[PDB]
Amino acid sequence: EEPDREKIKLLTQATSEDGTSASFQIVEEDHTLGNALRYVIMKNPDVEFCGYSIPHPSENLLNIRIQTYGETTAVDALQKGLKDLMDLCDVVESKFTEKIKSM
């Protein structure tokens, strides 16, 4: 049982006590998913602040930061955004399939 845990990492030096504010650090990412995910987290009506930041371009590290209002922690806003981007790639893949089957 070896799941990978060096991918996503909660930076505890910038995380609030309640969990309503937290910063993360994904390895091996950049503007690709850093901007596509930031778009979908900001569509949650409880996310007060969201943004990604690449600390240096020469290494593959991606700090994102979610701050909420209340009744949803900043981890629960990350995994709600990751679910709605999984569901957003299903809509693109299934519309683009139906237009190849229609030609």
Partner 1 sequence: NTLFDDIFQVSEVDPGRYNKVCRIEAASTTQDQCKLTLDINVELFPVAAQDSLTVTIASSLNATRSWRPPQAGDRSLADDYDYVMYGTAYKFEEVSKDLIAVYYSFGGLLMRLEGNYRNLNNLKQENAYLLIRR
Partner 2 sequence: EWNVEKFKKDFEVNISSLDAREANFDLINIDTSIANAFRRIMISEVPSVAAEYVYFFNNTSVIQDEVLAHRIGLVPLKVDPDMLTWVDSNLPDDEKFTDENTIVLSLNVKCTRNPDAPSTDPKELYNNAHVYARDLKFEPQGRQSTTFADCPVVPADPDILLAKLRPGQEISLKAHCILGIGGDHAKFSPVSTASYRLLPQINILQPIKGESARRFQKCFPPGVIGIDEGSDEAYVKDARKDTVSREVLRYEEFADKVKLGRVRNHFIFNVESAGAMTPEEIFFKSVRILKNKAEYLKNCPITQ
Partner 3 sequence: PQNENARAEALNLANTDSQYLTPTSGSPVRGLIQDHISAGVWLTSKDSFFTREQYQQYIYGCIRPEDGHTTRSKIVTLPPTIFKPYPLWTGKQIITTVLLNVTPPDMPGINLISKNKIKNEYWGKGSLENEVLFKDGALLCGILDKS
Binding residues vs partner 2 (CB under 8 A): 3-12, 24, 26, 31-33, 35-39, 43, 45, 75, 79, 82-93, 95-97, 99-100, 103
Instruction: Identify residues 18-57 at the interface with partner 1 (CB under 8 A).
Output: 45, 48
Q: Residue from 69, 83, 88, 97 that binds partner 1 (CB under 8 A)? A: 69
Rounded Cα–Cα distance for residues 84 and 80 (Å): 6
- Burial code (b: 16+ CB inside 10 Å, e: under 16) for 13-50 equals eebeeeebbbbbbbeebeeebbeebbebbbebebbeeb
**Minimum CB distance to partner 1 smaller for 8 or for 42:** 42
